Amino acid sequence: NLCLDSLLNGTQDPKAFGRVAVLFGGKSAEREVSLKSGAMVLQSLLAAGVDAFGIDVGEDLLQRLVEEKIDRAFIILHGRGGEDGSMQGLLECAGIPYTGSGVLASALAMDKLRTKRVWLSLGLPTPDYAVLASEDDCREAAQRLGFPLIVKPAHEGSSIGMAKVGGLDELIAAWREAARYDSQVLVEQWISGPEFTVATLRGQVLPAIRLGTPHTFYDYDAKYLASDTRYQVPCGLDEAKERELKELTARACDALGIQGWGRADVMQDAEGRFWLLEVNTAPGMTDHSLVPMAARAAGLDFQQLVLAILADSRE
Amino acid sequence: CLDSLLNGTQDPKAFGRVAVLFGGKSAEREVSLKSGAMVLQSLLAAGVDAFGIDVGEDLLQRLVEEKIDRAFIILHGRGGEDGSMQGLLECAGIPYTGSGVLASALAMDKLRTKRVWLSLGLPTPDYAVLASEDDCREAAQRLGFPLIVKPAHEGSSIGMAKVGGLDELIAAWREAARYDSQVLVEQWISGPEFTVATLRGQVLPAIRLGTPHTFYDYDAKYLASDTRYQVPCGLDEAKERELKELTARACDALGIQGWGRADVMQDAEGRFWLLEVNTAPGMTDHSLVPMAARAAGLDFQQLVLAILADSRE
Numbered sequence: 001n002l003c004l005d006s007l008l009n010g011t012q013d014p015k016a017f018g019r020v021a022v023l024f025g026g027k028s029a030e031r032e033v034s035l036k037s038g039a040m041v042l043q044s045l046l047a048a049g050v051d052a053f054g055i056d057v058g059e060d061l062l063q064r065l066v067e068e069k070i071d072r073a074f075i076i077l078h079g080r081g082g083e084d085g086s087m088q089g090l091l092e093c094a095g096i097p098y099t100g101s102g103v104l105a106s107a108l109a110m111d112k113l114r115t116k117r118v119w120l121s122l123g124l125p126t127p128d129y130a131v132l133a134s135e136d137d138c139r140e141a142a143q144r145l146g147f148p149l150i151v152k153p154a155h156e157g158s159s160i161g162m163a164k165v166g167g168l169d170e171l172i173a174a175w176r177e178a179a180r181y182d183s184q185v186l187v188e189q190w191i192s193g194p195e196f197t198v199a200t201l202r203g204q205v206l207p208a209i210r211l212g213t214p215h216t217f218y219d220y221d222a223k224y225l226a227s228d229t230r231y232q233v234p235c236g237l238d239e240a241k242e243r244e245l246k247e248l249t250a251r252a253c254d255a256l257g258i259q260g261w262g263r264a265d266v267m268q269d270a271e272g273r274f275w276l277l278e279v280n281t282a283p284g285m286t287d288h289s290l291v292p293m294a295a296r297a298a299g300l301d302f303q304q305l306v307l308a309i310l311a312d313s314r315e
Numbered sequence: 316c317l318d319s320l321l322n323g324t325q326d327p328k329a330f331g332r333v334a335v336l337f338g339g340k341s342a343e344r345e346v347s348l349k350s351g352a353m354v355l356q357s358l359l360a361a362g363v364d365a366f367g368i369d370v371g372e373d374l375l376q377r378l379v380e381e382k383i384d385r386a387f388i389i390l391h392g393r394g395g396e397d398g399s400m401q402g403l404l405e406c407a408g409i410p411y412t413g414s415g416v417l418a419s420a421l422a423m424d425k426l427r428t429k430r431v432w433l434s435l436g437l438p439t440p441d442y443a444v445l446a447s448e449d450d451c452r453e454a455a456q457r458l459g460f461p462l463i464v465k466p467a468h469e470g471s472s473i474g475m476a477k478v479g480g481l482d483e484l485i486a487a488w489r490e491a492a493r494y495d496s497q498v499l500v501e502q503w504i505s506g507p508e509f510t511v512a513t514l515r516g517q518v519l520p521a522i523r524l525g526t527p528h529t530f531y532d533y534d535a536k537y538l539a540s541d542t543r544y545q546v547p548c549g550l551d552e553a554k555e556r557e558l559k560e561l562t563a564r565a566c567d568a569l570g571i572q573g574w575g576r577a578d579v580m581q582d583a584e585g586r587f588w589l590l591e592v593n594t595a596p597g598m599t600d601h602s603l604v605p606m607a608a609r610a611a612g613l614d615f616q617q618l619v620l621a622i623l624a625d626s627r628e
């Protein structure tokens with residue numbers, strides 16, 4: 001449950017966190033988003049008076065880690081190399097405590113196919129889908145699922161490599177484009193209705209946000225470049241519905257082992273049923289970003305939000 | 316096919332400089348030290364440009380010093396087969412042997428591994444999660460006796476005990492909780508024990524295990540002199556094929572890559588029960604993957620080279 005008080009815990013002493021390294025950048029397709037998220041986190045942590053410094057994660061990372069003294073690592077990398085468990089395992093081997101989900105949870109939630117597979121085995125709702133690896137797999141998926149469809153790489157974020165398709169020819173093309181980012185490509189049935197995102201923080205589910213864009217879907221341009229994107233807090237859901245969405249988010253995150261914080265993306269169809277899309281374990285922290293927005297609705301500014309994430313890493 | 320296992324092993328210099336990672340900080344460090352020594356010595360004798368790293372608080376400094384084209388992971392337990400070392404190597408840009416981050420983390424967790432098996436309808440003993448004395452009492456009522464208690468993330472039978480009554484159930488739970496807050500307990504399977512190695516996607520001959528001890532515990536694995544190893548096992552062709560095929564499904568269910576070793580019990584009616592899968596199996600002189608590799612034809616040098624050759628993908 002949303003308890004503003006217990007959300008802030010190790011928050012009051014920015015000196016007690018030690019020297020904190022903010023890990024951002026990286027070599028994934030979401031690097032540009034990570035840079036903006038890192039600059040935001042580093043600036044807020046510095047203004048809070050924590051012993052913070054930034055590391056653009058690159059080829060010199062292991063050298064950086066042995067040279068600098070580091071008491072805590074705040075992971076704000078996006079995509080593979082940051083959210084997939086690899087950076088988490090590195091920090092565990094380096095004996096450095098870090099923020100967010102563990103190795104297994106991070107690796108699982110990065111894999112949309114494996115995440116959906118876990119969800120289905122627990123009776124949790126997630127759109128029907130197919131795995132695309134050939135033109136024949138596209139013809140099979142188009143036959144069984146109809147149109148429109150949503151094509152996505154399995155290990156991507158920020159809607160990169162994604163496409164809404166209305167025909168088999170558009171589907172084959174969208175499969176070949178996503179395959180440029182990831183040999184694992186999945187296609188989902190298009191859910192028509194409201195889009196919601198649900199942030200979680202230290203085990204607590206934050207107020208849901210309703211999303212809207214004139215674009216065909218919530219794509220890259222709608223997320224970080226456009227200006228006509230609509231964010232509604234509170235979401236227009238009634239009490240019993242927002243509780244249903246919140247309880248569903250908690251079951252979907254718990255099923256993956258999510259820890260510390262995260263953000264769930266959920267669609268709703270014309271009959272009111274919710275459908276789980278993905279879970280992000282190092283969500284964005286830019287100006288356009290949604291976890292900060294749901295935090296403000298909960299009652300925390302951007303400075304208390306990062307300190308709460310940092311304070312959770314102490315267990 | 317023994318031709319397929321040996322592919323990419325003809326030229327030992329094609330692997331470049333190979334770092335053997337062993338030791339570690341887990342409860343299985345002593346076993347990993349013996350495993351590392353065997354792997355390192357074999358590689359050097361094969362003409363591989365190999366050297367050893369004792370994984371400790373030193374790790375990152377060694378990795379920025381040494382030139383490494385490939386890493387042979389032969390760590391045991393948490394910090395080694397749990398995806399943590401695999402994740403570091405992928406950040407460092409060093410290719411490595413064995414399963415990946417997700418598969419290693421999954422196989423290290425006996426509970427989630429069992430849950431993955433149950434969801435696919437694969438047999439594995441009925442169990443309970445123990446976090447309190449009440450949990451012990453609930454399990455005793457539902458499961459009966461005897462039972463076997465184990466930590467979720469351990470190996471080499473560390474922290475394990477077979478228990479025949481409720482009083483020793485709770486004692487076994489507290490001892491197992493010294494190694495891991497995640498503790499499970501299974502119904503004891505009375506019958507033959509097997510282990511089944513897998514290599515480069517191929518299931519090797521199964522081995523039958525016996526010991527005077529109440530189970531295949533740490534002493535029976537590395538100290539006693541009277542542990543019994545049967546290759547071929549006394550199973551007929553249809554039953555050993557059944558065992559090999561179930562091993563393949565159980566390993567593929569976890570994403571196991573390169574090599575591994577599955578532990579399987581057989582009850583009094585012939586049915587097989589999956590226990591666990593190890594993603595960096597032991598390579599000591601008491602170890603079972605070298606024994607199953609010899610049953611398939613390969614000597615110790617071909618086994619390590621086959622493992623190394625598979626990591627080139």
Ligand SMILES: Nc1ncnc2c1ncn2[C@@H]1O[C@H](COP(=O)(O)OP(=O)(O)O)[C@@H](O)[C@H]1O
Binds near residue numbers: 127159219
């Ligand atoms: N099955 C679907 N039905 C409708 N819209 C979808 C579907 N899958 C994805 N989308 C749209 O694509 C966006 C990105 O997809 P998502 O699965 O969240 O992955 P990511 O954001 O990591 O690329 C979502 O915000 C949503 O608007």
Ligand SMILES: Nc1ncnc2c1ncn2[C@@H]1O[C@H](COP(=O)(O)OP(=O)(O)O)[C@@H](O)[C@H]1O
Binds near residue numbers: 532
């Ligand atoms: N359900 C069971 N029934 C009978 N014996 C078991 C059972 N579970 C474990 N054992 C015994 O304990 C040993 C170790 O169990 P295992 O699950 O392989 O743990 P570890 O990872 O420590 O080897 C096995 O080799 C087997 O002899």
Ligand SMILES: N[C@@H]1CON=C1OP(=O)(O)O
Binds near residue numbers: 033157
């Ligand atoms: N992966 C992105 C980057 O920050 N927030 C994330 O969530 P997503 O865009 O994948 O829905």
Ligand SMILES: N[C@@H]1CON=C1OP(=O)(O)O
Binds near residue numbers: 343346578593595597
């Ligand atoms: N994890 C141990 C150490 O090396 N070999 C392993 O097999 P296990 O004892 O877990 O059955």
Ligand SMILES: [Mg+2]
Binds near residue numbers: 156157158159278280
């Ligand atoms: Mg995402």
Ligand SMILES: [Mg+2]
Binds near residue numbers: 158159265278
């Ligand atoms: Mg998303």
Ligand SMILES: [Mg+2]
Binds near residue numbers: 469470471591592593
């Ligand atoms: Mg084991």
Ligand SMILES: [Mg+2]
Binds near residue numbers: 472591
């Ligand atoms: Mg075992």
